């Protein structure tokens, strides 16, 4: 009788094991769903990062010196350069570096300088200190 009892206990144990396996499978499915969600979140994040690293690097960087514009000047042809950079260029050539149209006017741009200061303010203290050094270095030049 303890025979059939033992057998009954074994059957119950097997059923419990099956239930545990089912639970494990459900957990695995949940984990997979979470991973998919994480991937989607990463993709959503990515666009802003690309936009920032073609903001800061493609619109804000002087083509002559590869630094964020320092004392931005905008030419008649609508292209902008650091004041220092474009003056050195103009001692040798009077054509826009980018479009090669003859340079007819320069103007400083408070908005570009202020925008850049705000943007750079959110970058690493290495980037911020480098900018400070160039500003003073090109001021000494002045």
Partner 1 sequence: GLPRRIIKETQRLLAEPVPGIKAEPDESNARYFHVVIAGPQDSPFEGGTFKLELFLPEEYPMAAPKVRFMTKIYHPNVDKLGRICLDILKDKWSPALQIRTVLLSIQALLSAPNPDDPLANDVAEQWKTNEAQAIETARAWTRLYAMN
Structure tokens at 139: 């001021």
Annotate each residue in 18-57 with x if it binds Zn ion (CB under 5 A) or - if it does not, as one string: ----------------------------------------
Torsion angles phi and psi, residue 67, rounded to 5: -105, 160
Please state the closest distance from residue 85 (CB atom) to partner 1, in A: 8
User: How many residues sit in the footprint of partner 1 (CB under 8 A)?
Assistant: 15
Please state the closest distance from residue 101 (CB atom) to Zn ion, in A: 5
What is the C-alpha to C-alpha distance for residues 40 and 123, in angstroms, rounded to an integer? 26
Contact 120, 131 (CB under 8 A): yes
73 in contact with Zn ion (CB under 5 A):
no
Annotate each residue in 34-73 with x if it binds a second copy (CB under 8 A) or - if it does not, as one string: xx-xx--xx-xx-xxx-xx-xx--xxx--------x--x-
Which of a second copy, Zn ion, partner 1, none does residue 15 bind to, with CB < 5 to 8 Å depending on kind?
A: none
Residue with Cβ nearer partner 1 (63 or 123): 63
* Residue ranges in 44-83 that form contacts with partner 1 under rule CB under 8 A: 63-67
Chain positions contacting partner 1, by CB under 8 A: 63-67, 85, 88-89, 91-93, 95, 97-98, 100
């Amino acid at each position: 009788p303890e025979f059939q009892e033992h057998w009954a206990l074994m059957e119950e144990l097997n059923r419990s094991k099956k239930d545990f396996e089912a639970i494990i499978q459900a957990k695995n499915k949940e984990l997979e769903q979470t991973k998919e969600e994480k991937e989607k979140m990463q993709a959503q994040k990515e666009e802003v990062l690309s936009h920032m690293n073609d903001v800061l690097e493609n619109e804000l960087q002087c083509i002559i010196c590869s630094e964020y514009f320092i004392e931005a000047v905008t030419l008649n042809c609508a292209h902008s350069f650091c004041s220092y950079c474009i003056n050195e260029w103009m001692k040798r050539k009077i054509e826009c570096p980018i479009c090669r149209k003859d340079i007819k006017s320069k103007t400083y741009s408070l908005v570009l300088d202020n925008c850049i200061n705000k943007m750079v303010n959110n970058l690493s203290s290495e980037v911020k200190e480098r900018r400070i050094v160039l500003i003073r270095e090109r001021k000494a030049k002045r």
